[PDB]
C-alpha cells in the first residue's frame, strides 16, 4: 500500500540457462542440494556486497542496488556484484563437473519500492529500471552480462564493455586493471 519512489537505482536479473533440461535430468534431492548451494552462495555474496535481493523466482534471482539505502556508486556496485555472481556460477560445478551458465541483465534508472507485509519477499521493487533489466536478461546471450546505454555510460570509465553485435546493448566484460 505504501509506495516509495527512488530517482536512481540499479537492478539485476539472473537466470539459469537450461534449467528445465537440468531439472529433468537430475534427481529431485540432488537438484535441491545443487540449487541450495548455488543460492546460499548468491545470498552470501549479496550481503557481502551490501546489496538487497528483492525476488527469487524459481531459477531467477533479482538484486537491487541503491534501495532502500541510496548510494552514488549504485551502478558500479551492482556491476562488481554481477561479475562476482557470474564467476561464482562458473566455479560452482554440479556433481558432474559442469558449471551453471547464467543469463544476467543489468539496468539503471528510477524505481518504486514498497512493503507488502504478508509476503516472504516483503519489499517489492518495480518500475523503469526493473522493466529494462528484465528485458536485458530476456534477450541476453549465454554467459554474458547485458546492459543498456544508460548503464554503459556509468561504467565505461572503470569497466570494459563490448557492444553487442531501436536499442543498442553492451556486454560487461570486467573491471579495468588500470585507467
Amino acid at each position, epitope marked *: 500500500i505504501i509506495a516509495d519512489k527512488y530517482d536512481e537505482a540499479s537492478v539485476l536479473f539472473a537466470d539459469i540457462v537450461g534449467f528445465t533440461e537440468r531439472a529433468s535430468s537430475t534427481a529431485p534431492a540432488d537438484l535441491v542440494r545443487f540449487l541450495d*548451494r548455488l543460492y546460499s*552462495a548468491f545470498d*552470501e*555474496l549479496v*550481503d*557481502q*556486497h*551490501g546489496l538487497e535481493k528483492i525476488k527469487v523466482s524459481g531459477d531467477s534471482y533479482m538484486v537491487v542496488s541503491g534501495v532502500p539505502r541510496p548510494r552514488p*556508486d549504485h551502478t*558500479q*556496485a551492482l556491476a*562488481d*556484484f554481477a561479475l*562476482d555472481m557470474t*564467476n*561464482v556460477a*562458473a*566455479q*560452482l560445478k554440479d556433481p558432474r563437473g559442469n558449471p551453471v551458465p547464467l543469463r544476467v541483465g543489468l539496468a539503471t534508472g528510477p524505481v518504486v519500492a514498497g512493503v507488502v507485509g504478508s509476503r516472504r519477499f516483503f519489499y517489492d521493487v518495480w518500475g523503469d529500471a526493473v522493466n529494462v533489466a528484465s528485458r536485458m536478461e530476456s534477450t541476453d546471450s549465454v554467459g554474458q552480462i547485458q546492459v543498456p546505454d544508460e548503464v554503459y555510460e556509468r561504467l565505461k570509465d*572503470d569497466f570494459v564493455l563490448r557492444e553487442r553485435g531501436v536499442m543498442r546493448t553492451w556486454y560487461l566484460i*570486467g*573491471r*579495468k*586493471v*588500470a585507467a
Partner: nanobody
Amino acid sequence: QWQLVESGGGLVQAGGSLRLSCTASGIILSINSMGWYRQTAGNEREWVAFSTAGGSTTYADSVKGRFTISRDNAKNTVYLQMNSLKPEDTAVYYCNTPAGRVGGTWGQGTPVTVSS
C-alpha cells in the same frame, strides 16, 4: 599456481590488536573481491569482512567497528586490522575470493588466539 597465504596471527590478550595479511599470487587483486573468514568450529567459515574491487567494505555485525579490511594493489595483498579483540574472536582466519569460497579452494589460514 593460484594461491593465497595468510599471516599475522598469534596470541593476544583481550582488548589487544592484530594485523592479518593475505598475499595473493596468480590473480590481479584490483579486479577481484576479497573477503576474510573465520572458523571457530561451532560452525564453518563465516565471513567477517569483505572488500569489493571498487573499494566498498562491509563487515559482519559482530566485528564491525573493531575490524577494518583494506587493500594494497602494489603488494597484491589484503589486510585485516583487528582491534578491541574478544575471546569470541578466537579462530583460524582465511581470505578468499568469491570463486575460491564456492570452489572450496582455501589456504592454510592464520591462527588468532585471544587469552591470557
